[PDB]
Design a protein around this motif. Structure first.
Motif, PDB file in Angstrom:
ATOM      1  N   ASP A  77       0.837  -1.205   0.000  1.00  0.00           N
ATOM      2  CA  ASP A  77       0.000   0.000   0.000  1.00  0.00           C
ATOM      3  C   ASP A  77       0.880   1.267   0.000  1.00  0.00           C
ATOM      4  O   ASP A  77       0.811   2.115   0.915  1.00  0.00           O
ATOM      5  CB  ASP A  77      -0.982   0.031   1.185  1.00  0.00           C
ATOM      6  CG  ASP A  77      -2.187   0.967   0.918  1.00  0.00           C
ATOM      7  OD1 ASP A  77      -2.112   1.682  -0.098  1.00  0.00           O
ATOM      8  OD2 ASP A  77      -3.199   1.021   1.687  1.00  0.00           O
ATOM      9  N   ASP A 113      -6.083  -7.215   2.411  1.00  0.00           N
ATOM     10  CA  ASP A 113      -6.166  -5.895   3.054  1.00  0.00           C
ATOM     11  C   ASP A 113      -4.999  -5.594   3.990  1.00  0.00           C
ATOM     12  O   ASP A 113      -4.896  -4.473   4.472  1.00  0.00           O
ATOM     13  CB  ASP A 113      -7.472  -5.755   3.853  1.00  0.00           C
ATOM     14  CG  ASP A 113      -7.661  -6.884   4.823  1.00  0.00           C
ATOM     15  OD1 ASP A 113      -6.901  -7.913   4.719  1.00  0.00           O
ATOM     16  OD2 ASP A 113      -8.588  -6.759   5.669  1.00  0.00           O
ATOM     17  N   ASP A 114      -4.156  -6.589   4.293  1.00  0.00           N
ATOM     18  CA  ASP A 114      -2.976  -6.322   5.124  1.00  0.00           C
ATOM     19  C   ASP A 114      -1.841  -7.216   4.716  1.00  0.00           C
ATOM     20  O   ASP A 114      -2.045  -8.116   3.910  1.00  0.00           O
ATOM     21  CB  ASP A 114      -3.259  -6.411   6.622  1.00  0.00           C
ATOM     22  CG  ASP A 114      -3.573  -7.819   7.092  1.00  0.00           C
ATOM     23  OD1 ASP A 114      -3.857  -7.901   8.309  1.00  0.00           O
ATOM     24  OD2 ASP A 114      -3.555  -8.811   6.286  1.00  0.00           O
ATOM     25  N   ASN A 312      -9.775   3.356  -3.944  1.00  0.00           N
ATOM     26  CA  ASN A 312      -9.365   1.986  -3.674  1.00  0.00           C
ATOM     27  C   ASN A 312      -8.924   1.361  -4.944  1.00  0.00           C
ATOM     28  O   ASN A 312      -9.724   1.134  -5.802  1.00  0.00           O
ATOM     29  CB  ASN A 312     -10.523   1.182  -3.069  1.00  0.00           C
ATOM     30  CG  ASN A 312     -11.221   1.937  -1.979  1.00  0.00           C
ATOM     31  OD1 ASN A 312     -10.581   2.366  -1.003  1.00  0.00           O
ATOM     32  ND2 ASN A 312     -12.553   2.184  -2.153  1.00  0.00           N
ATOM     33  N   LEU A 315      -9.512  -3.233  -4.820  1.00  0.00           N
ATOM     34  CA  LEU A 315     -10.761  -3.730  -4.265  1.00  0.00           C
ATOM     35  C   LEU A 315     -11.634  -4.490  -5.288  1.00  0.00           C
ATOM     36  O   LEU A 315     -12.073  -5.604  -4.985  1.00  0.00           O
ATOM     37  CB  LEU A 315     -11.550  -2.592  -3.622  1.00  0.00           C
ATOM     38  CG  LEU A 315     -12.850  -2.897  -2.883  1.00  0.00           C
ATOM     39  CD1 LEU A 315     -13.034  -1.921  -1.696  1.00  0.00           C
ATOM     40  CD2 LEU A 315     -13.996  -2.760  -3.821  1.00  0.00           C
TER      41      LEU A 315
END
Ligand code: DGP
Ligand code: CA
Length: 581
Positions: A77, A113-114, A312, A315
DNA sequence: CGAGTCAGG
DNA sequence: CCTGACTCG
């Protein structure tokens, strides 16, 4: 839980600034705009390092290392860190690998997401989920420095090890360029767009809010009259009790919970009672008020009078962007009352203007390219009105025999064929029987037999390969394509037909954004991107730049890729987003 | 925090 | 077919 060794550094040293490192610039807040950076981790050939941000970010050598693009960083990210750094006046450069975007290309369905979720993809488990470390609810908190520092170091260590196997797989998938030349450069452009934000005229909005509140108040009373009592109009349950129990209105549709009160239903019910079109008006005005007036106002920053969305990029299952807090991809346009909301989105400098350029029918154009249907490709080569043409072919009438209702139906067919709408789907949208809908579809395929070939082929390809693909090699796995449940299988088949269409249109416009940003820089224009809305790009620029942009922007967008049919781009500019029409 | 509804593509 | 925000219970 043994410990990973690292230096908890009290100051920055030269070995912390090697020309290749995994970097973590940790921002814990969901919404990263002007948010705290809580800690920093670096892993490189020399070891593993935690730095406190007050130390590291006041260090001119560390800052210079951050902005040196010859110092190559691997991250997760990168946009989150880039933006939170832009808010501190610090430039991040030389990001050569973003694990988040790498995981997203290999498998958008993972919902990565992580760092830990990306790591699982390669059996790497020496790192905790962020939620396990930070918590989730009101209970989401930054832990004490030893817990925090170990977590960040573990994340950076995971990024350092995982880059190799992620690149190996992207390469085998022929997605290495998709990552390096498309998604990573796009990530920097989105960060600029987010940081720049869009100026909002809060007065215009507050005035509209006043008028809406007055009307909404009138319509509210009228509904309480027509029902002979007061109730919560925004409660679908209570409303369903007023319509179908007190007033005895027919039930045409049920939800899984109870009675449907969806617009569709309500229009059908309009003839029977007056209170119906008032509930419709109320819904319309109530949506504008609570979502577009009150919702937008709450997120504009009073320091700048701007909204700063987050795009995003990892996504959607098809390769589209999405937008949140605020969602600037669903500002009203279809009905005039809602569209006026756009008069509140204004240029950020005086004597600048909003410029909007949109692809005309990109999805159908892509369909024509990929299906190689002669008739559909001819229609676009002639730049015909595509709905009129579809009406002509499916009803076999001449042009001036096409009635508006016939055009409306061909339009609903053109809207649904890009996802292989079923006879039931189309019957629903058109209010006709499924057998009548099947006939339209049968007529469509007689006129566009290449589309039919495409739809059969893409479903066989999804079955054999296990996935489908877009022009620039984005993937989506479709395991349901072989399910023995008809509904389940049918969905997967529509996804098989739609994904190359929708995903390829996402590819093209993403490329257009990259080419446009390089051309703006070459030209030394002050014009810059504000927004992307799926098939449309919105810029602001000095008034003196408008004639130049009228030529440059459509051009870049039209030439982003070369298809068997032309791409066509319309453009408009004005004082406010509303006026750029 | 799932469901419903409705804004956009 | 692909989304996100608001509201309710
Ligand atoms: N899950 C959930 N159910 C609710 C709530 N309030 C009322 N109900 C029923 C809430 O906040 N959450
Ligand atoms: Ca209410």
């Amino acid at each position: 839980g043994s410990k990973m060794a690292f230096t908890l550094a009290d100051r920055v040293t030269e070995e912390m600034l090697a020309d290749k490192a995994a970097l973590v610039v940790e921002v814990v807040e969901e919404n990263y705009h002007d948010a705290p950076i809580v800690g920093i981790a670096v892993v490189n050939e020399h070891g593993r390092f935690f730095l406190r941000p007050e130390t590291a970010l006041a260090d001119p050598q560390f800052v210079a290392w951050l902005g040196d693009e010859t110092k190559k960083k691997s991250m997760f990210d990168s946009k989150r860190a880039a933006v939170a750094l832009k808010w501190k006046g610090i430039e991040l450069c030389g990001v050569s690998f973003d694990l988040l975007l790498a995981a997203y290309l290999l498998d958008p369905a993972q919902g990565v997401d992580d760092v830990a979720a990306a790591a699982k993809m390669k059996q790497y488990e020496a790192v905790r989920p962020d939620e396990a470390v930070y918590g989730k609810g009101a209970k989401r908190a930054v832990p004490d420095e030893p817990v925090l520092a170990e977590h960040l170091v573990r994340k950076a260590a995971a990024i350092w090890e995982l880059e190799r196997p992620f690149l190996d797989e992207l390469r085998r998938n022929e997605q290495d360029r998709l990552l390096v030349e498309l998604e990573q450069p796009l990530s920097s452009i989105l960060a600029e767009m987010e940081f720049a934000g869009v100026k909002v005229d809060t007065k215009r909005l507050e005035q509209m809010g006043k008028e809406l509140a007055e009307q909404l108040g009138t319509v509210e009373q009228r509904i309480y009259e027509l029902a002979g009592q007061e109730f919560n109009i925004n409660s679908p349950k209570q409303l369903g009790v007023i319509l179908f129990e007190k007033l005895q209105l027919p039930v045409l549709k049920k939800t899984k919970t109870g009675y449907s009160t969806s617009a569709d239903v309500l229009e059908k019910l309009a003839p029977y009672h007056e209170i119906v079109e008032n509930i419709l008006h109320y819904r319309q005005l109530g949506k504008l008020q609570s979502t577009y007036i009150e919702g937008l106002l709450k997120v504009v920053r009073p320091d700048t009078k701007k909204v700063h969305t987050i795009f995003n990029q990892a996504l959607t299952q098809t390769g589209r962007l999405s937008s949140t807090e605020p969602n600037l991809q669903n500002i009203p346009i279809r009905l005039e009352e809602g569209r006026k909301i756009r008069q509140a989105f204004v240029p950020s400098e005086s004597d600048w203007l909003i410029f909007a350029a949109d692809y005309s029918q990109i999805e159908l154009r892509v369909l024509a390219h990929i299906a190689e249907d002669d008739n559909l490709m001819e229609a676009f080569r002639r730049d015909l009105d595509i709905h009129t043409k579809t009406a002509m072919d499916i009803f076999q009438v001449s042009e001036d025999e096409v009635t508006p209702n016939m055009r409306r139906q061909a339009k609903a067919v053109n809207f649904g064929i890009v996802y292989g709408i079923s006879d039931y789907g189309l019957a629903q949208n058109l209010n006709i029987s499924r057998k009548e809908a099947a006939e339209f579809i049968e007529r469509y395929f007689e006129s566009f037999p290449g589309v039919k070939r495409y739809m059969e082929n893409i479903v066989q390809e999804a079955k054999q390969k296990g996935y489908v693909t877009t022009l620039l090699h984005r993937r989506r796995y479709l395991p349901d394509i072989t399910s023995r449940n008809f509904n389940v299988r049918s969905f997967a088949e529509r996804m098989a037909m739609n994904t190359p269409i929708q995903g390829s249109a996402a590819d093209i416009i993403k490329k257009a954004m990259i080419d446009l940003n390089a051309r703006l820089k070459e030209e030394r224009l002050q014009a810059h991107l504000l927004l992307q809305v799926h098939d449309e790009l919105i810029l602001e620029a000095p008034k003196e730049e408008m004639e130049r942009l009228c030529r440059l922007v459509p051009e870049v967008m039209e030439q982003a890729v070369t298809l068997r049919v032309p791409l066509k781009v319309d453009y408009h500019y004005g004082s406010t987003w509303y006026d750029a029409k």
